[PDB]
Structure formats: C-alpha cells, structure tokens
C-alpha cells in the first residue's frame, strides 16, 4: 500500500527478424550519418513515429467533418505543427503519414549542433551535448534527445559554465598551470 509510482514503459521496438541484411544495412546508416550511441538509439526513433502513426492512421478514418474528428484531427494539427516539421498554413491531417524516420533528427536536438552550422561534423552533435555546454532559454541541457519545438530554434545557444560558449576557460588550462606556469612560476 506504498506511495510508489511503478509507471514505466519501453522506448524501442523489439525487431521481429534478427538478421535481415536490409536491417543491418538501412539501420546502420542511421549511426555515422547522424552520430548515435548503439543500435538501441536507432530503434526508439521508429517507436516515436509508431506512436504518431497508430492514431494518425485512424484520425483520417473517422466521420467526415465530425467535431470528434475535427477537434482530435486538429488536436494533432495543433501538436505536429508545433514541433516544427509540417508547414504553418499548409498543415494537413492527411499529410501526417507522409513523414519518414529522420524527420525527427531533422528537428531533434541530437543533430541540431550540426544543422544551423555551429558544429565541426555529424559526430560533434554528441560530445558538446555529453558535457551540457548548450541550453534552451537560460536552461542547461545535457540529454541530446530534447524535442526542440518550431518556436525555440534561434534560442538553441550556449551555457555560461562553457569554454565553448559565453563563459570562463576550464580545467586543463588550469592544469597547464602545473606544466606551463609550473615551469614559469
């Protein structure tokens, strides 16, 4: 009778066939082209669309101009506009399925270091985010799986405890005070 949650779900699909050459071909291209950590990191990217798809397939199949359709069909056209993929005026409940796997990594913060042109390469959209040197509106972010909306893309900027932002020089420049200023005094 304890005040404990126990409310937890999985994030990634359990891939039905284990040694499709096509799966080891197609879903390994989603590592080096986008900089990911293992095959588990590739697998949840579909599951987020598998959540979107499952209702979106059925949010067309409701009655024509029904207020349960026209609110919940437009409740997702208030949702999937906001994340910043489908157009501002050319939003449409029918084009929602016309939407592929990397459309998340076109918008998701795991890539957004490389996207605007504020990186070195594709892999560089992990290591700065591994050490929380960026933020979203005076709010530091260490987890690279942040859902950046349409609105807060220009607000993707740097922290104040960051030598690669608007901050102070760090530790090895202070540990070079043992090598450089140890030999200089």
């Amino acid at each position: 009778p304890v005040a404990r949650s126990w409310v937890c779900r999985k994030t990634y699909v359990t891939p039905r066939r284990p040694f499709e050459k096509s799966r080891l071909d197609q879903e390994l291209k989603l590592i080096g082209e986008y900089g990911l950590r293992n095959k588990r990191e590739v697998w949840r990217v579909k599951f987020t669309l598998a959540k979107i798809r499952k209702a979106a397939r059925e949010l067309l199949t409701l009655d024509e101009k029904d207020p349960r359709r026209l609110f919940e069909g437009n409740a997702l056209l208030r949702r999937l506009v906001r994340i910043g993929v489908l157009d501002e005026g050319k939003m449409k409940l029918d084009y929602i399925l016309g939407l592929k796997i990397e459309d998340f990594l076109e918008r998701r913060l795991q890539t957004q270091v490389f996207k605007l042109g504020l990186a070195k390469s594709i892999h560089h959209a992990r290591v700065l985010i591994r050490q929380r040197h960026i933020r979203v509106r005076k709010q530091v972010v260490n987890i690279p799986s942040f859902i950046v909306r349409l609105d807060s893309q220009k607000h993707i900027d740097f922290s104040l405890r960051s030598p690669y932002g608007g901050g102070r020089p760090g530790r090895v420049k202070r540990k070079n005070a043992k090598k450089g200023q140890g030999g200089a005094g």
């Binding site: 390994l28 291209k29 590592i31 080096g32 082209e33 900089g35 990911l36 950590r37 293992n38 892999h123 992990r126």
Partner: protein
Amino acid sequence: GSLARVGKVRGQTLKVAKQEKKKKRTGRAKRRMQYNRRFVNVVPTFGKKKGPNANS
C-alpha cells in the same frame, strides 16, 4: 559403455597462450569505422559482394 576416455580431446590441445589485445572501441566508438568501412571507405568494384573475414 566407456566412461574412461571422457574429455579425451580437451586435454591434448597444446595450450597456445592467448596473444594479448588492445581493447576494441566500445559503445558508439565501435560504430564509427563500422559506418566508414562498410559504405564510404571503399569504391564499389567489379564482382560479387565479398565477406568481411573472407580470407581467400
């Protein structure tokens, strides 16, 4: 039957000592060359799709 010659072939493999190892890159670090080597390091040449360990 003959519970005497049990594990006959286990013992008589001349124990060739395990040659030492620089640890393989782990986590994401495995999956960098594994992107480069499969797709983009090589040019598609003439013939069949060859094997990784195919020591012909």
